[PDB]
Amino acid sequence: GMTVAAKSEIQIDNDEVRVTEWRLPPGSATGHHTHGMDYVVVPMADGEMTIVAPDGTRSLAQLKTGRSYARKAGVQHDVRNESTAEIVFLEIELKA
Amino acid sequence: GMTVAAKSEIQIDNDEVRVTEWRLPPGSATGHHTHGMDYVVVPMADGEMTIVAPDGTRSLAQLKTGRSYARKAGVQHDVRNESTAEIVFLEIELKAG
């Protein structure tokens, strides 16, 4: 298939967190997925993510290196890189 | 005093987590503190971070951009910048629970 895959590396997966480094080449996509845990995103590169909602509507979100944000369990989205730059962020999922 | 204060900004703080951005200018220190929460360090820049143990001995943590690591509640240290470059990292502390 033509869709380019997002790359992931799990850096930590202990009793507190699962930390995954995500790298999205230009023209890649995570595919739609569902979040089962609250999480923090730490962007490692400046960029522009495309977020596709379950209904197909689309939004762009700016990532700024070192500017973290928090999200709750239940988020459902496809994250795509429609930009010319590799997107890089760490996702820190918050375990119980 | 001649030591420069470390700078901190709390980016996120909620019932599950606290995320603090630490910026240490050359010649700065956090001051000795203890950690009451397990945490994760995310270095935002390569650096050499001085860690002063309770016994006064020092070591130089080798921080690599984007290479996170985990630490346990109970850590007691002063962290300093004796290098020529600003040190920057996020610290992500987990709440109970």
Ligand SMILES: [Ca+2]
């Ligand atoms: Ca624990």
Ligand code: NI
């Ligand atoms: Ni996601």
Ligand code: NI
């Ligand atoms: Ni500390």
